[PDB]
């Protein structure tokens, strides 16, 4: 042979890369060995390492012991050569030529070497780049590669210790196979055999999004998974600055021509991950010169309706991409249901959203890291004080919490293989099963046991934002079929307003501009304000509250479909309200002893959602601001009263709870009225009897690639929350940006 | 959704 015996090689007469032997053939050799179309090695050099009597046999056996321990892939001289002998390839640093050069065999490539390389740098640019370089760009080129590239010293490696390196794009021979410089809430990768955790990715498996966008790696994914995994790690170790191709390339360390493929591909993958919002997001803001996506994406215009978390998330993204965005907001402020009172001494208290439920991988957690801000993790302790002063017996709460969960356990048994039509309110179902235990057991509940049960139901009502007789037994917890956000529940101490303001910074936002009509029967979208001002763009994104879609505040033309409307009306616009009280001194410290909150056992069944729980707004235990919630039927019981009457009502409750002392009068308070705020009229969505969690998906479907929908009530995995809304913003920005 | 519960959350099913 003076030619390659592998089917279809573009090399009629090959050169050896290795030079391991003195007997290294330009010339004839029994067999050539094919690694790539531009890269071959002779049988002398093959014998050099493979054969006992030869010199390189030492190296190869050493290497094959290491490779068998760490990796799953089979040791072989081909493998050895690809891992250990093939030359490195480096592009030039200087922008004039940027030509790819081969390094001499005796030199190991490193990040700093690849950062600062000019043509012919021994430890010049007029010489023409190697023939094989342009051939690397061909489709089939990757097809004629014996082995998938394996990366050396990958930033992702510490994160991936539980996997075999080769099963995940990495070299099992690399010495460098909670990490330093990484937030405890950033866990981007699933561990092997780990149950559902929100936003995690499998490092060894392409996701469906990735398969559809990159179907060429359906056959062989390992080059993809290596580069994705690297990028994710680069992003999560340095999430305050834009990840760019320039910053990635120095971390791709693999020998051979395949390195050039890697470098060219890393750019497409990066843009895909940016658009999707997996990388280069949060409150990262880019300067006016720079944009996160290339000029191709920029010939699009968007108007975004609503400037809550959903509308702001989408705006920020699209802005950062280089797309033209303008935001129209009904109120005289941004934030929607994020609205923070800054006027209390020391602490900061939200009128809407303030807790984060599950920080791990939560985009809110990433934004807190970016702005260097604090989250207070909630403690477990919450004692239930009764109207009178008696902290409930520990063995009473424990067992009523048990009984409560068993009811729900019976509900989920009941609901199997039922249909929307067979559905029934969760509240009815609960009490039915409740009466059954009474009857079939014979044992009855005391007045206290009953009161403590009621507290637990009110927590459900708080969670749903409704009386349980409105909430679907079949589907109330639908979203839990999906992976939820793991980790800490935290109080967001400086408030979500810091985040909301940062997101908003330097965007085209029009306040006091409610939209009245949206016309998309034309070529352009036509958007009209209540006063009459007109805006037009190629695409529009509605992010208004569920309750306003239900009231039909906006005229759509064409109207929404009967399907969309059935979706919209099958969900409930849930409601809670809050009260915040200031005091001169912390009157609860003695009794409460530094818990984040304390319970309140409802005196009667009909007073159930009336200040069920009081939150201590100072993690520092210095200031005296309490916060409390009104939920369920209690919200109805408070519709008529004015703030003062409510405040008194709250005060009656506190003096009864803290009987054994003098309760000081409040110096400062607010009472929230979200339900009557004409542009909001709710706190969060929930599934009504008869409904399905598919409603979210339906509400989320764009009309004719021009009208798009984001928001709290469009996020099936993560309904109700700032995180959910934010993520729906990022999801829609991604579709809008596409093509 | 119960994913809104912070204090004394349900483990129902
Ligand atoms: C009291 C309360 C407590 C909450 N607690 C939490 C919590 O602890 N953690 C959490 O994650 N979430 C919590 N939530 C829910 C969270 O606030 C919302 O789910 C989230 O804000 C939804 O964001 P959004 O973008 O979908 O909707 P919004 O924030 O409501 O954005 C809607 C925006 O659209 C504007 N708009 C309406 N109609 C028009 C129009 N025609 N033209 C232009 N603009 C219009 C509105 O003015 C509003 O600014 C709470 C909410 C409330 C009310
Ligand atoms: Zn060949
Ligand atoms: Zn040779
Ligand atoms: Zn050069």
State the Cα–Cα distance between residues A679 and A545, nearest whole angstrom: 8
Angle between helices A309-321 and A496-504 in degrees, nearest 10 = 40
**CB proximity A185 to B under 8 Å:** no
The technique is X-ray
Angle, in degrees to the nearest 10, between helices A447-464 and A394-414: 60
Q: Residue A534's CB: how many other CB atoms inside 10 A?
A: 10
CA–CA dist A339, A136 (Å, integer): 55
Whole-angstrom Cα Rg for chain B: 7
3-state secondary structure of A89: strand
Task: Give the C-alpha separation, A278 to A273, whole Å.
Answer: 5
- Containing H/E element for A327? strand A324-328
| Cα–Cα distance for residue pair A388/A658, rounded to 1 Å | 7
Q: What is the DSSP track for A458-489?
A: HHHHHHHTS-TTSBBTTTTTGGGGSPP--S-E
Taking CA atoms only, the protein residue closest to ligand 1 atom 34 is A306
Sorted by where each begins, the domain ranges of chain A are 1-291, 292-739
* Ligand 4 centroid, distance to A134 Cα (angstroms): 16
Other CB atoms within a 10 A radius of the CB of residue A124 amount to 10
Cα separation, A355 vs A721, whole angstroms: 9
Distance A90 CA to ligand 2 centre (A): 23
Q: What is the CA radius of gyration of chain A?
A: 31
If you count them, how many residues does chain B have?
Answer: 13
> Cα–Cα distance between A559 and A519 in angstroms, integer?
9
Closest CA to A581 of A611, A554, A556, A560: A611
- Pick the closest to residue A481 from A728, A313, A722, A696 (CA basis): A696
CA dihedral of A577, A502, A306, A292, whole degrees rounded to 10: -140
Considering only CB atoms, which chain A residues are within 8 Å of B8? 382, 401, 455-456, 459, 599, 613
Q: Are A89 and A102 in contact (CB under 8 A)?
A: yes
d(C-alpha A699, C-alpha A565), whole Å: 8
Interface of A with B in 474-513 (CB under 8 A): 476-480, 484-485, 489
Sole residue written with tokens 């912390």: A586
Contact criterion met (CB below 8 Å) for A306 and A544: yes
What DSSP element (H or E) covers A528?
strand A525-529
Beta carbons of A405 and B13 less than 8 Å apart: yes
| The two structure tokens encoding residue A404 | 């409560």
Chain A contact set for B7 (CB, 8 A): 378, 382, 459, 596-597, 599, 613
Ligand 1, residue A355: give the atom nearest the CA: 8
CA-to-CA distance for A555 and A562, rounded, in angstroms?
A: 15
Token pair in block for residue A184: 């405890």
Three-point CA angle A599, A604, A608, nearest 5°: 55
CA A357 – CA A637 distance, rounded (Å): 29
Three-class secondary structure assignment of A355-416:
EEECCCCCHHHHHHHHCCCCCEECCCCCCEEECCCCECCHHHHHHHHHHHHHHHHHHHHHCC
Q: Which residues of chain B does A484 touch, with a Cβ-Cβ cutoff of 8 Å?
A: 3
* Cβ atoms < 10 Å from Cβ of A678: 11
Could you tell me which chain B residue has the CA closest to the CA of A407? Answer: B12
**CB proximity A357 to B under 8 Å:** yes
Angle at which helices A258-276 and A222-237 cross, to 10°: 60
* Nearest partner of A514 among A486, A491, A539, A544, judged by Cα: A544
Grouping H, G, I as helix, E, B as strand and the rest as coil, residue A501 is helix
d(CA A733, CA A285): 16
The H helix count followed by the E strand count for chain B is 0, 0
Task: Say which of B1, B3, B10 has its CB closest to residue A459.
Answer: B10
Distances (CA, A) of A277 to A236, A487, A504, A730: 13, 22, 17, 6
Pair A716, A700: CB distance under 8 Å: yes
Asked if A335 contacts A308 with a C-beta cutoff of 8 angstroms, the reply is: yes
| Pairing mode, strands A509-510 and A525-529 | unpaired
User: Do A599 and B2 lie within an 8 Å CB cutoff?
Assistant: no
Please report, for residues A224, A515, A644, the alpha-carbon distance to residue A218 in angstroms, rounded to integers and kept in the order given: 10, 45, 65
Ligand 1 atom with least separation from CA of A554: 41
A229, two tokens? 């995994």
Question: Residues of A forming the annotated binding site for Zn(2+)?
Answer: 4, 9, 16, 24, 34, 40, 42, 45, 92, 97, 119, 125
Q: Is A200 exposed, middle or buried (0-12, 13-18, 19+ CB in 10 A)?
A: middle
DSSP label at residue A298: G
**Are residues A671 and A577 in contact, defined by beta-carbon separation less than 8 angstroms?**
yes
Q: In the numeric block, which tokens belong to residue B1?
A: 């959704």
- Judge whether A113 and A93 are in contact, CB under 8 Å: no
The backbone torsions φ and ψ at residue A712, rounded to the nearest 5 degrees and listed phi first, read: -30, -50
- How far apart are alpha carbons A370 and A353 in whole angstroms? 20
For residue A315, give every residue at least 6 positions away whose Cβ sits within 8 Å of its Cβ, in sequence order, or none.
A304, A307, A325, A327, A503, A504, A507, A509, A729
| Cα A419 from Cα A91, distance rounded (Å) | 61
Ligand 1 pocket residues where CB is under 6 Å: A 305-311, 328-331, 336-338, 352-355, 514-515, 543-545, 548, 553-554, 576, 578, 672, 674, 679-680, 683-684, 711-712, 720-723, 725
Start-end of H helices in A122-184: 132-135
A634, A603 Cβ separation under 8 angstroms: no
- Cα separation, A409 vs A407, in Å, equals 5
Residues 6+ positions from A640 with CB-CB distance below 8 Å: none
H or E segment and range at residue A548: helix A546-551
| Residue A459 in contact with partner chain B when CB distance is under 8 A | yes
Distance (Å, whole) CA A624 – CA A617: 8
**Separation between Cα atoms, residue A192 and residue A595, nearest integer Å:** 37
Resolution (A): 2.7
Residue A241 to residues A281, A497, A504, Cα–Cα distance (Å): 10, 22, 18
Looking at the partner chain, which of B6, B7, B10 has a beta carbon nearest the beta carbon of A460? B10
Q: What is the DSSP string of A570-638?
A: HEEEE--EEEEEE-SS-TTHHHHTT-SEEEEE-SSGGGTTEEEEEEE--TTS-S-EEEEEE-THHHHTT
Rounded alpha-carbon distances, angstroms, from residue A718 to A373, A480, A702: 23, 9, 19
- Describe the strand order of the beta sheet including A489-491 as a list of residue ranges: A355-357, A489-491, A376-377
A470 and A688 Cβ atoms separated by less than 8 Å: yes
Residue A425: Cβ within 10 Å count: 19
What is the phi/psi pair of residue A311, to 5°? -65, -35
Cα–Cα dist A713/A688, whole Å = 13
Q: Dihedral sign, CA of A338, A488, B4, A281?
A: positive
Instruction: Give dist(CA A140, CA A697) in Å, integer.
Output: 39
**A408 → chain B, closest CA residue:** B12
Q: Please name the helix (run of DSSP H) or strand (run of DSSP E) that holds residue A34, with its range, or none.
A: strand A33-36
Inter-CA distances, A176 with A64, A67, A236, A303, A307, Å: 17, 13, 19, 48, 46
How distant is the Cα of A314 from the closest Cα of chain B, in angstroms?
23
């Amino acid at each position: 042979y003076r030619k390659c015996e592998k089917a279809g090689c573009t090399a009629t007469c090959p050169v050896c890369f290795a030079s391991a032997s003195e007997r290294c053939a330009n010339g004839y050799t029994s067999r050539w060995y094919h690694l790539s179309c531009g890269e071959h090695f002779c049988n002398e050099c093959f014998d050099h390492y493979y054969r006992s009597h030869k010199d390189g046999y030492d190296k190869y056996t050493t290497w094959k012991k290491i490779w068998t321990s760490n990796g799953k892939t089979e040791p072989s001289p081909k493998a050895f050569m690809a891992d250990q002998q093939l030359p490195y390839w480096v592009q030039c640093t200087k922008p004039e030529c940027r030509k790819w050069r081969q390094l001499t065999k005796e030199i190991q490539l490193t990040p700093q070497i690849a950062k600062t390389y000019r043509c012919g740098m021994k430890p010049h640019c007029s010489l023409p780049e190697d023939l094989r370089v342009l051939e690397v760009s061909n489709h089939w080129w990757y097809s004629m590669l014996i082995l998938p590239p394996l990366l050396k010293d990958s930033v992702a490696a510490p994160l991936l210790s539980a996997y075999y390196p080769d099963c995940v794009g990495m070299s099992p021979s690399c010495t460098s196979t909670h990490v330093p410089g990484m937030n405890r809430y950033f866990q981007p990768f699933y561990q092997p055999n780990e149950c559902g955790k929100a936003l995690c990715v499998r490092p060894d498996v392409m996701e469906l999004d990735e398969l559809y966008e990159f179907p060429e790696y359906s056959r062989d994914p390992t080059m993809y998974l290596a580069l994705r995994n690297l990028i994710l790690a680069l992003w999560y170790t340095n999430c305050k600055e834009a990840l760019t191709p320039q910053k990635c390339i120095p971390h791709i360390i693999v020998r051979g021509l395949v390195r050039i493929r890697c470098v060219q591909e890393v750019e497409r993958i990066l843009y895909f991950m940016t658009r999707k919002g997996l990388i280069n997001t949060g409150v990262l803001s880019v300067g006016a010169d720079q944009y996160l996506l290339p000029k191709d994406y920029h010939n699009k215009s968007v108007i975004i309706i609503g400037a809550g978390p959903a509308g702001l998330a989408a705006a920020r993204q699209l802005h950062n991409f280089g797309i033209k965005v303008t935001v129209l907001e009904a109120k005289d402020r941004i934030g929607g249901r994020v609205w923070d009172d800054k006027s209390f001494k020391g602490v900061t208290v939200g009128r809407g959203a303030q807790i984060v439920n599950g920080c791990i991988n939560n985009p809110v957690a990433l934004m807190c890291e970016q702005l260097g801000i604090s989250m207070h993790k909630f403690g477990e302790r919450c004692d239930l004080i009764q109207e009178g002063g008696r902290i409930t017996d520990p063995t009473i709460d424990k067992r009523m919490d048990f009984h409560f969960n068993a009811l729900l356990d019976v509900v989920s048994e009941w609901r199997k293989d039922k249909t929307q039509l067979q559905d029934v309110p969760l509240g009815e179902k609960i009490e039915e099963i409740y009466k059954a235990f009474i009857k079939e057991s014979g044992i009855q509940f005391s007045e206290l046991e009953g009161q403590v049960l009621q507290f637990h139901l009110s927590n459900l009502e708080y969670a749903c934002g409704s009386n349980l007789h409105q909430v679907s037994a079949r589907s109330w917890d639908h979203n839990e079929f999906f992976a939820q956000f793991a980790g800490d529940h935290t109080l967001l101490t400086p408030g979500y307003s810091v985040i909301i303001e940062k997101l908003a910074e330097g965007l085209d936002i029009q306040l006091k501009s409610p939209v009245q009509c949206i016309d998309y029967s034309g070529d352009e979208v036509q958007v009209t304000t209540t006063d009459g001002t007109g805006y037009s763009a190629q695409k529009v994104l509605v992010t208004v509250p569920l309750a306003l879609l239900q009231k039909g505040a906006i005229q759509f033309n064409p109207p929404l479909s009967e399907k969309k409307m059935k979706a919209i009306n099958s969900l409930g616009a849930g409601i809670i309200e809050k009260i915040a009280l200031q005091f001169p001194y912390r009157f609860w410290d003695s009794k409460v002893q530094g818990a984040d909150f304390f319970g309140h056992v409802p005196p009667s069944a009909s007073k159930r959602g009336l200040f069920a729980v009081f939150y201590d707004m100072d993690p520092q235990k210095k200031h005296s601001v309490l916060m409390s919630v009104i939920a369920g039927e209690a919200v109805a019981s408070v519709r008529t009263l004015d703030d003062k009457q409510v405040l008194q009502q709250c005060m009656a409750t506190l003096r009864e709870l803290f009987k054994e002392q003098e309760v000081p009068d409040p110096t400062k308070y607010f009472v929230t009225r979200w339900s009557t705020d004409p542009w909001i009229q709710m706190a969060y969505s929930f599934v009504k009897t008869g409904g399905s969690g598919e409603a979210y998906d339906i509400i989320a479907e764009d009309i004719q690639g021009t009208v798009f929908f984001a928001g709290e009530a469009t996020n099936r995995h993560f309904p109700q929350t700032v995180t959910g809304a934010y993520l729906s913003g990022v999801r829609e920005a991604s579709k809008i940006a596409a093509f | 959704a119960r994913t809104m519960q912070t204090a004394r959350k349900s483990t129902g099913g």
